[PDB]
Amino acid sequence: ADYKIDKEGQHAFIEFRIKHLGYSWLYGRFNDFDGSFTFDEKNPSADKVKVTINTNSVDTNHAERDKHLRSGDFLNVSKNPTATFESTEVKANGDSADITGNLTLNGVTKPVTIKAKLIGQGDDPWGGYRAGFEGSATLKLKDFGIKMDLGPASQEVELLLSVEGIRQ
């Protein structure tokens, strides 16, 4: 069974944090992404996911910071308007799954493993069928060519992902 991520209902989130000066966590998100996934409980090998993210939609609730994040110093939105994650392997791992795939971010393509778990599923109030998932992953800024050094404690960004899918 194939699912479309609920973008219209905005039951889908890409949330991140990174330390500011190693003093506190700075929280942000991307407001504009789309994708789909195959969730097959009978044949879990068939499982796949693809997400496309418009990186100009970066949002840390600070206009000037977000403008700086859009620039060539950071996400370089003008050169690369989109980020893509497309799974290459979904492996069962205890009471969750490991979703390995290619992340292309800032023109660079490198593998990322998302630790993923089913949150809930079932028929919705409006007739449809839904399945929702949580994911976690981290990345090093330098691995995707993000030039500017933010200090020694700010090399990694932590990702918390939520997707609610509507079965097609």
Ligand X SMILES: COC1=C(OC)C(=O)C(C/C=C(\C)CC/C=C(\C)CC/C=C(\C)CC/C=C(\C)CC/C=C(\C)CC/C=C(\C)CC/C=C(\C)CCC=C(C)C)=C(C)C1=O
> What are residue 37's phi and psi, to 5 degrees?
-155, 155
Question: CB within 8 A of 94, min separation 6: which ones?
Answer: none
Q: Cβ 18 to ligand X, closest distance in Å?
A: 5
Sort 87 into a burial class: Cβ within 10 Å, 0-12 / 13-18 / 19+: buried
Contact 81, 57 (CB under 8 A): no
> What are residue 40's phi and psi, to 5 degrees?
-130, 105
| Shorter beta-carbon distance to ligand X: residue 100 or 123 | 100
Q: Cβ 126 to ligand X, closest distance in Å?
A: 22
Q: Cβ 16 to ligand X, closest distance in Å?
A: 5
Q: Under rule CB under 6 A, which residues in 25-84 are in contact with ligand X?
A: 26, 30, 37, 39, 47, 49, 51, 53, 55, 62, 64-65, 68-69, 74, 83
> What are residue 144's phi and psi, to 5 degrees?
-110, 30
Whole-number Å distance between alpha carbons of 168 and 96: 24
Site string for ligand X, 103-142 (x = CB under 6 A): x-x------x-x-x----------------x-x-x---x-
Q: Does residue number 8 form part of the binding site for ligand X (CB under 6 A)?
A: no
Measured in whole angstroms, how far is the alpha carbon of residue 116 from the centre of its chain? Answer: 11
Question: Which residues in this chain contact ligand X in the complex, by CB under 6 A?
Answer: 14, 16, 18, 20, 26, 30, 37, 39, 47, 49, 51, 53, 55, 62, 64-65, 68-69, 74, 83, 85, 90, 99, 103, 105, 112, 114, 116, 133, 135, 137, 141, 146, 150, 154, 157, 159, 161, 163
